[PDB]
Amino acid sequence: RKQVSDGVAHIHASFNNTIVTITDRQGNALGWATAGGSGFRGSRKSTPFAAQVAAERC
């Protein structure tokens, strides 16, 4: 069995899109998602629910 027990999360929110990453302080991203990638476009790309399901999916 192999677990990390420690992590780092980074949220980058703009008026174009919201990006969510889960990564390691000595490694690379092990989860990545976007609010546009939740199935919301144009005026909806960066909305609270579009990002709420992106963080959940990640």
Added chain:
RNA sequence: AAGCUUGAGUCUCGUAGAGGGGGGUAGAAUUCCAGGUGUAGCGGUGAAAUGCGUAGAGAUCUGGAGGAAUACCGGUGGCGA
């Protein structure tokens, strides 16, 4: 035609500063190169499409390549016709 030090000009030890060149010193990501991580949409708009996509477009790591450009400090602060 001789003076004067009062305009003009000169020397010591010192002074601020984006003035003009050349050589040094560095990074960022869009890009480009290779091998990995790894995916269903990506981009844009009031709303879309041309375009680009599972043959991995989109996103990203690691060591290399390249072109424009120099945040901070910097102040109703300086240099000069």
